[PDB]
Amino acid sequence: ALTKSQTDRLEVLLNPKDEISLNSGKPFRELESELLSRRKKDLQQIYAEERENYLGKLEREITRFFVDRGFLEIKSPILIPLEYIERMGIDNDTELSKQIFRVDKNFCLRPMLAPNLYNYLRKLDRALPDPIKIFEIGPCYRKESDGKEHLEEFTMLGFQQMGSGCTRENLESIITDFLNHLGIDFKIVGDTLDVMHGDLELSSAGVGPIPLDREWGIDKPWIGAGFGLERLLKVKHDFKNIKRAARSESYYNGISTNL
Amino acid sequence: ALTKSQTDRLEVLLNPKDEISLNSGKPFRELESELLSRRKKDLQQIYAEERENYLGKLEREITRFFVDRGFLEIKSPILIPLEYIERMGIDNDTELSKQIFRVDKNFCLRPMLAPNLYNYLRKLDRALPDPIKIFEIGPCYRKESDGKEHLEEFTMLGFQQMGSGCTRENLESIITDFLNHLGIDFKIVGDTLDVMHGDLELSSAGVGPIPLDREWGIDKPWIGAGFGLERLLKVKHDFKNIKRAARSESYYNGISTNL
Numbered sequence A, B: 001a002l003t004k005s006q007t008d009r010l011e012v013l014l015n016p017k018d019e020i021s022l023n024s025g026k027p028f029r030e031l032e033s034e035l036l037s038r039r040k041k042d043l044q045q046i047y048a049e050e051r052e053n054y055l056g057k058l059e060r061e062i063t064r065f066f067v068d069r070g071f072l073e074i075k076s077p078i079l080i081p082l083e084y085i086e087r088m089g090i091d092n093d094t095e096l097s098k099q100i101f102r103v104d105k106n107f108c109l110r111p112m113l114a115p116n117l118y119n120y121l122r123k124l125d126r127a128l129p130d131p132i133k134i135f136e137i138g139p140c141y142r143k144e145s146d147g148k149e150h151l152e153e154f155t156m157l158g159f160q161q162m163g164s165g166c167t168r169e170n171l172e173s174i175i176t177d178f179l180n181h182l183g184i185d186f187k188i189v190g191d192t193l194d195v196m197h198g199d200l201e202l203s204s205a206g207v208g209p210i211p212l213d214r215e216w217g218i219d220k221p222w223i224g225a226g227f228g229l230e231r232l233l234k235v236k237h238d239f240k241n242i243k244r245a246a247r248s249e250s251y252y253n254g255i256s257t258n259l
């Protein structure tokens, strides 16, 4: 009989496509040696053939999708003014206010892309023709309880369109084309618009104007959404825990690095 | 006569390829309106034609270079254990110990990629054939005095090879091919190996083994280097201040967003 600790170890080495049973009478040491051999070959094949990281590769594929669709690629600060949090309406009565990683006395690690995207929409409206379409992909940070769907360090895609054409139908079309392009199954569940995979939230999306826009110097209609890249990878690759998809020292493209 | 404040404003709108003189008798308001028109057209042309961010595009071009050359693409944590700093030999007598952005009580924003690259070399040596070649590109953070060559939030490329072929000559060949591929002029100045553009340091590079390797479980020869992407962009585009190349709300591909 395998111990729970032994089973935890084998689960670290198990990949979703393996068809190995941990509840059949082979001893731990030989089930471990089998999976170790498989995972070493997996890494050797990546090293020999493609050599790209899942998170980097997904970011580049999403970038090509949105650039192609007419969205400007933004790279804005990750370390942001603490003031941006309150100005997003995130006060002591929200879950998020307790989730901020503060840095120094006036800065924090951004928990979302919305403040920077708002600032870019306002500034670019002075220069670019209507409608203004932008997107950003990059690290975001939230303190979280331990859970198979949450990372404290994750990667967000955020896109926003401002001006003409900012309808819920156009927003759903972007989301639908995007996820069908990636091969991710989803349901849009009705502003309040969430993109679900089963009970996992892939995205929250919105349609403006909303009262908050005024604080950011925004007075035009808009649509947009935010997506977690590690959740997309978790669904795409059928990972049991989002840790497999994270920036990590423990996993490379979902393969354990502790061999 | 232009005021210094007026000149600062015009310098924000000036791009290196402009051939406009701020010391000739045109009034401020018309020099400003001229440069505003030019910068709006610059942004409109980016939006119409390519839509890619300089920092993102450079990261993707560097990624293709190193992948093609046989290096595995790594994406490791940006928020790292504080312990990694001391284990890198960075104690109270180094400049760096005073430059760390601490997060919480046991974490910090990484000021360099070396700790994570060391960990990946050790782990991958259990699985990959000799030599082991890896690289990472991503955010790094250091507290800095105000200066035209330093950002507090920047982007590092780090690469490392471990095992056979780890000679200074092979290291210089990687650097030389890399910078000639990017079109960046440089001089290698002699371990202690720095890559200079004039008096600007583009990279510091090294040849192991060194005593520090032991703390990280490394006992093989190695070569590697770290490069700042915003310094490469600053040189490539002849920016006067590295702020033009940063993750920023103030500049897009070196164009002022305050129009």
Ligand SMILES: Nc1ncnc2c1ncn2[C@@H]1O[C@H](COP(=O)(O)OP(=O)(O)NP(=O)(O)O)[C@@H](O)[C@H]1O
Residues within 6 Å of the ligand: A112, A142, A144, A149, A150, A151, A152, A153, A154, A155, A156, A201, A202, A203, A204, A226, A227, A228, A229, A230, A231
């Ligand atoms: N801790 C996290 N780790 C990974 N991805 C996240 C995390 N928090 C949010 N995301 C993703 O970012 C997107 C937009 O963020 P947001 O809608 O604010 O998250 P949220 O509503 O807190 N989701 P949840 O925490 O699962 O209820 C979401 O659709 C998630 O896929």
Ligand SMILES: Nc1ncnc2c1ncn2[C@@H]1O[C@H](COP(=O)(O)OP(=O)(O)NP(=O)(O)O)[C@@H](O)[C@H]1O
Residues within 6 Å of the ligand: B112, B142, B144, B149, B150, B151, B152, B153, B154, B155, B156, B201, B202, B203, B204, B226, B227, B228, B229, B230, B231
């Ligand atoms: N604050 C910064 N902003 C942008 N790039 C940086 C910064 N610090 C270091 N880099 C780049 O990262 C590379 C490796 O880092 P490292 O050699 O530790 O920097 P360094 O020796 O402190 N350079 P300097 O601070 O200019 O004397 C350097 O060659 C720089 O190009």
Ligand SMILES: N[C@H](Cc1cccc(Cl)c1)C(=O)O
Residues within 6 Å of the ligand: A112, A113, A114, A117, A156, A157, A158, A159, A160, A204, A205, A206, A223, A224, A225, A226, A227
């Ligand atoms: N950071 C994302 C990005 C986003 C997209 C559209 C509109 C807005 Cl305001 C924000 C989110 O929180 O869902």
Ligand SMILES: N[C@H](Cc1cccc(Cl)c1)C(=O)O
Residues within 6 Å of the ligand: B112, B113, B114, B117, B156, B157, B158, B159, B160, B204, B205, B206, B223, B224, B225, B226, B227
């Ligand atoms: N973070 C870089 C990366 C690097 C490359 C090779 C060897 C080492 Cl140990 C470190 C630097 O500090 O120069």
Ligand SMILES: [Mg+2]
Residues within 6 Å of the ligand: none
């Ligand atoms: Mg949440």
Ligand SMILES: [Mg+2]
Residues within 6 Å of the ligand: A201, A203, A204
């Ligand atoms: Mg949500």
Ligand SMILES: [Mg+2]
Residues within 6 Å of the ligand: none
């Ligand atoms: Mg320095």
Ligand SMILES: [Mg+2]
Residues within 6 Å of the ligand: B201, B203, B204
């Ligand atoms: Mg140096």
